[PDB]
Amino acid sequence: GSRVMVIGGDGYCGWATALHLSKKNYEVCIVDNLVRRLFDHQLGLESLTPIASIHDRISRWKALTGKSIELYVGDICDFEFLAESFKSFEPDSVVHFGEQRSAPYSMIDRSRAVYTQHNNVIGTLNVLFAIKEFGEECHLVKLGAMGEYGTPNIDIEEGYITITHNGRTDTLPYPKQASSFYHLSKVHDSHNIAFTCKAWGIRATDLNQGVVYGVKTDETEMHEELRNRLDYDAVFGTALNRFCVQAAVGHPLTVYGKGGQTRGYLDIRDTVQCVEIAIANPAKAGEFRVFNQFTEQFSVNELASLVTKAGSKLGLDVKKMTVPNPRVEAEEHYYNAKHTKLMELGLEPHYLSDSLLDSLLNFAVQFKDRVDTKQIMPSVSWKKIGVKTKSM
Amino acid sequence: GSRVMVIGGDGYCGWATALHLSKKNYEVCIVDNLVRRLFDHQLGLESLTPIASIHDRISRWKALTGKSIELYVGDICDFEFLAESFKSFEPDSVVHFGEQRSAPYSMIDRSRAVYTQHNNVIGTLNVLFAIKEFGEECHLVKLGAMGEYGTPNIDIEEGYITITHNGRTDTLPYPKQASSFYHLSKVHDSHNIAFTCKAWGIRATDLNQGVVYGVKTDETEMHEELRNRLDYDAVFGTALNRFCVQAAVGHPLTVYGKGGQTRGYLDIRDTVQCVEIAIANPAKAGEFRVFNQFTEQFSVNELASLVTKAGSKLGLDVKKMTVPNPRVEAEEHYYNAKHTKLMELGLEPHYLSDSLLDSLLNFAVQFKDRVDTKQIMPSVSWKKIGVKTKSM
Numbered sequence: 001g002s003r004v005m006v007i008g009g010d011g012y013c014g015w016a017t018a019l020h021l022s023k024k025n026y027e028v029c030i031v032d033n034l035v036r037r038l039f040d041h042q043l044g045l046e047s048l049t050p051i052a053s054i055h056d057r058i059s060r061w062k063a064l065t066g067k068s069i070e071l072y073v074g075d076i077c078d079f080e081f082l083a084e085s086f087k088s089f090e091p092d093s094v095v096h097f098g099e100q101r102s103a104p105y106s107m108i109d110r111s112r113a114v115y116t117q118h119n120n121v122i123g124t125l126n127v128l129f130a131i132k133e134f135g136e137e138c139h140l141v142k143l144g145a146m147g148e149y150g151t152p153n154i155d156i157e158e159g160y161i162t163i164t165h166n167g168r169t170d171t172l173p174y175p176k177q178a179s180s181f182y183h184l185s186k187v188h189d190s191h192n193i194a195f196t197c198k199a200w201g202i203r204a205t206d207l208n209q210g211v212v213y214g215v216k217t218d219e220t221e222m223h224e225e226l227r228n229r230l231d232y233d234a235v236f237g238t239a240l241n242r243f244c245v246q247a248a249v250g251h252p253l254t255v256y257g258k259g260g261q262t263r264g265y266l267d268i269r270d271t272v273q274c275v276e277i278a279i280a281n282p283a284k285a286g287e288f289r290v291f292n293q294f295t296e297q298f299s300v301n302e303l304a305s306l307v308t309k310a311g312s313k314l315g316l317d318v319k320k321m322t323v324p325n326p327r328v329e330a331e332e333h334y335y336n337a338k339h340t341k342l343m344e345l346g347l348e349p350h351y352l353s354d355s356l357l358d359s360l361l362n363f364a365v366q367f368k369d370r371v372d373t374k375q376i377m378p379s380v381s382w383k384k385i386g387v388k389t390k391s392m
Numbered sequence: 393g394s395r396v397m398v399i400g401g402d403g404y405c406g407w408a409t410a411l412h413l414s415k416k417n418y419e420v421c422i423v424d425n426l427v428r429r430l431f432d433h434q435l436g437l438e439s440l441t442p443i444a445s446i447h448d449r450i451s452r453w454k455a456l457t458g459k460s461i462e463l464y465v466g467d468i469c470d471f472e473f474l475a476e477s478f479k480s481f482e483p484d485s486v487v488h489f490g491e492q493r494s495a496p497y498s499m500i501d502r503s504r505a506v507y508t509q510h511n512n513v514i515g516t517l518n519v520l521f522a523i524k525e526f527g528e529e530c531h532l533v534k535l536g537a538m539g540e541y542g543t544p545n546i547d548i549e550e551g552y553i554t555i556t557h558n559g560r561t562d563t564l565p566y567p568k569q570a571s572s573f574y575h576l577s578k579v580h581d582s583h584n585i586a587f588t589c590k591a592w593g594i595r596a597t598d599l600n601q602g603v604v605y606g607v608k609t610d611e612t613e614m615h616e617e618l619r620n621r622l623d624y625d626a627v628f629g630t631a632l633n634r635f636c637v638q639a640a641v642g643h644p645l646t647v648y649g650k651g652g653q654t655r656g657y658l659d660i661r662d663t664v665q666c667v668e669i670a671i672a673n674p675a676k677a678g679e680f681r682v683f684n685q686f687t688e689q690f691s692v693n694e695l696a697s698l699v700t701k702a703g704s705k706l707g708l709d710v711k712k713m714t715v716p717n718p719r720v721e722a723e724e725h726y727y728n729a730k731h732t733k734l735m736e737l738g739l740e741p742h743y744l745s746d747s748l749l750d751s752l753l754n755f756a757v758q759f760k761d762r763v764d765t766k767q768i769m770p771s772v773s774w775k776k777i778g779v780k781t782k783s784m
């Protein structure tokens with residue numbers, strides 16, 4: 001074999017996924033403009049782990065396994081490029097990881113908020129038109145976001161909710177409440193895709209994924225040049241990965257506000273597993289499937305405690321600090337998000353364990369010398385965002 | 393006064409509104425790039441009524457009343473232009489009519505779907521950033537769309553719905569189900585604005601307006617050069633206006649599919665009244681108000697019957713025809729949309745009457761010679777939309 005186009009395949013989730021699908025014998029190609037690497041240069045950021053170029057990454061995989069991952073370098077917002085890549089590869093499935101995924105980045109200034117929505121929304125529209133025009137039966141596996149739902153006072157369902165209002169009943173799209181221009185772009189994406197499923201018969205699966213943690217997967221650990229990136233800076237780094245790196249370098253864990261913010265999380269190993277499951281068990285024509293893709297819920301305070309305990313076993317004397325929250329969000333809220341669709345399809349989860357934390361912490365300690373502590377604290381305010389293009 | 397910036401002020405709703413607000417003694421400016429006029433040239437379309445240039449329109453209003461409506465010609469997607477206009481005028485309220493509003497236009501091809509979403513979503517984001525940076529207390533009166541709600545099997549509320557799910561209760565944004573790339577862009581707009589209200593304290597009112605009908609308002613009828621446009625073509629024309637022109641020229645009323653499609657409608661005279669009410673009674677800081685802006689619900693078949701009866705009184709022997717529906721939508725559906733917020737604020741509606749239809753029909757008969765019958769039938773398919781840029 002089945003042919004899979006992995007848009008955003010040079011990224012954190014995409015690279016691990018591309019290697020896994022190739023290993024699982026799918027014919028794979030990567031479509032990426034590598035803009036994520038440019039952002040690192042422009043903002044003065046760097047991965048904890050040194051990573052190889054996309055060309056060397058692909059070359060190494062071929063040298064080790066003999067398998068060739070085709071590469072198409074370009075911006076999917078450029079339809080000519082996307083169309084040519086689609087017609088050249090003829091994918092049976094498209095996994096779309098190719099979007100600006102940082103909430104902080106989307107809040108830096110007007111230019112970055114606009115770039116985020118334009119890049120994400122238009123790129124996704126182009127993908128939908130490419131599928132419709134060149135391969136209508138192609139299954140779109142889209143990366144959405146648990147953040148699309150916000151933090152309502154009721155249980156969060158997997159995309160849909162059956163409501164009884166004024167004596168009548170109907171099943172409707174779950175109300176969306178995004179908290180950043182980035183999360184908003186995903187809400188727009190989801191609405192756009194749902195429409196094309198009904199109007200054109202597109203088959204798609206929206207994976208509303210929670211926060212990913214970890215850096216190792218079976219494939220990326222096979223050789224140093226296959227190593228994935230591990231972000232710890234305040235722009236692209238996420239909660240758990242950030243805390244592990246902070247613990248390793250002796251920086252107090254950065255708890256934003258009260259720390260009651262609760263979210264779904266999952267090991268990167270499950271990210272690749274879930275994507276493969278979505279591909280192996282495709283949506284039907286005209287069907288817009290929605291899966292909440294995470295394995296466990298944790299509050300920020302809970303993560304801090306887990307990392308502190310894990311760090312103690314390594315003599316890291318982990319400390320915690322309360323950082324004035326740069327974001328506008330509920331710091332104490334109800335949270336009960338449903339997640340059974342992937343489990344019903346055979347997901348064998350890697351729940352957060354002492355072993356994982358020990359491994360991730362030792363990893364951060366291993367490359368502690370590469371950590372730029374100046375990038376640990378957040379400097380992007382949700383409320384103070386301006387129109388002048390900022391230079392970090 | 394009070395200063396009002398009318399974005400899209402050269403358009404159908406915007407021009408009538410700009411004149412009305414000026415008459416009501418608000419200081420008014422019009423921000424428009426006049427792209428709507430370019431679309432007419434590019435697609436071979438033309439208004440039933442001959443209209444004057446925006447410059448001659450404004451000059452005539454000044455000659456008659458002595459009042460000057462300031463004009464800023466530019467694309468609001470160009471932030472430099474928008475910022476300069478905002479700083480020059482210093483609006484207390486911004487009424488945003490400046491978007492690609494045609495559902496058929498948004499479905500012509502990929503380029504037009506992408507243009508629709510980019511122009512609308514990015515332009516609106518720019519407006520939000522301009523307000524935040526140059527006049528945070530400025531009230532945004534946004535034109536949304538009743539189409540954002542789709543046609544669910546339950547009552548449609550005014551933006552929000554209180555739900556009891558699994559033993560818990562909460563008031564959430566009403567589930568959105570748009571049926572075109574244009575309607576989708578409005579859903580995106582609404583979500584984006586709602587976010588800024590919470591994050592930045594923006595005050596806004598989303599006017600989810602129904603289908604507008606009519607061509608006359610007190611101000612536009614004061615002189616021929618102030619005359620508003622009246623679209624009847626299948627791209628920009630809407631249901632009732634189209635039927636009236638069809639009746640006048642002897643063309644069978646174009647009922648798409650079964651004709652059970654039910655929607656909210658309102659006289660253009662109420663469009664201007666509602667906008668003024670929204671301006672005179674502003675939203676509070678951080679509040680995202682949502683009003684369903686229409687006065688009555690009608691099915692397509694009901695409109696056909698009303699126009700036929702009205703036409704008979706003018707000896708137009710109106711006939712009806714069933715056109716294979718170019719759109720993907722429910723042709724028989726439940727529809728009960730709530731609309732009381734504007735009434736509670738003092739709306740004195742002009743319900744559809746025999747007088748209005750007689751006037752509108754005679755108007756169409758008056759300019760029947762200008763009607764290009766080749767543009768009456770729809771040629772844009774929701775399902776057959778392609779990627780090649782079309783030339784109509």
Ligand SMILES: NC(=O)c1ccc[n+]([C@@H]2O[C@H](COP(=O)([O-])OP(=O)(O)OC[C@H]3O[C@@H](n4cnc5c(N)ncnc54)[C@H](O)[C@@H]3O)[C@@H](O)[C@H]2O)c1
Binds near residue numbers: 033074212
């Ligand atoms: N990292 C997480 O914790 C997490 C959690 C939930 C969902 N996701 C989602 O998974 C997807 C991938 O996330 P990630 O962490 O791998 O991100 P990433 O930034 O590491 O990877 C994204 C890749 O997309 C590419 N890209 C962006 N815009 C592109 C364009 N216009 N054309 C071609 N390529 C483009 C970038 O160059 C980059 O290689 C995103 O949608 C993201 O929101 C990630």
Ligand SMILES: NC(=O)c1ccc[n+]([C@@H]2O[C@H](COP(=O)([O-])OP(=O)(O)OC[C@H]3O[C@@H](n4cnc5c(N)ncnc54)[C@H](O)[C@@H]3O)[C@@H](O)[C@H]2O)c1
Binds near residue numbers: 423425536
């Ligand atoms: N006409 C209706 O029946 C109806 C019904 C409900 C809601 N509305 C809404 O009211 C608004 C106005 O509708 P209308 O019928 O007056 O439309 P219109 O096309 O007559 O007017 C829109 C105006 O906006 C201007 N414009 C578009 N993009 C612009 C940009 N980037 N920069 C500056 N100016 C720009 C166009 O040149 C045009 O003069 C739209 O949001 C529409 O969806 C209209």
Ligand SMILES: O=c1ccn([C@@H]2O[C@H](COP(=O)(O)OP(=O)(O)O[C@H]3O[C@H](CO)[C@@H](O)[C@H](O)[C@H]3O)[C@@H](O)[C@H]2O)c(=O)[nH]1
Binds near residue numbers: 102145146259
């Ligand atoms: O050092 C930190 C980092 C984060 N947080 C909080 O932890 C929560 C999660 O934040 P973070 O880990 O930054 O993730 P998100 O910004 O939600 O974004 C990630 O997880 C999302 C899932 O919804 C994906 O959609 C995004 O692409 C991905 O970047 C939030 O309440 C943050 O305010 C802290 O308290 N301290």
Ligand SMILES: O=c1ccn([C@@H]2O[C@H](COP(=O)(O)OP(=O)(O)O[C@H]3O[C@H](CO)[C@@H](O)[C@H](O)[C@H]3O)[C@@H](O)[C@H]2O)c(=O)[nH]1
Binds near residue numbers: 602603629647721
């Ligand atoms: O000749 C016609 C024209 C329309 N319809 C149907 O009538 C309904 C209303 O269509 P139309 O009058 O074209 O309006 P919309 O496409 O809904 O759009 C208008 O009304 C919307 C309110 O939701 C605004 O948001 C849009 O900007 C404005 O163009 C639909 O079911 C159409 O399929 C017919 O049966 N015959």
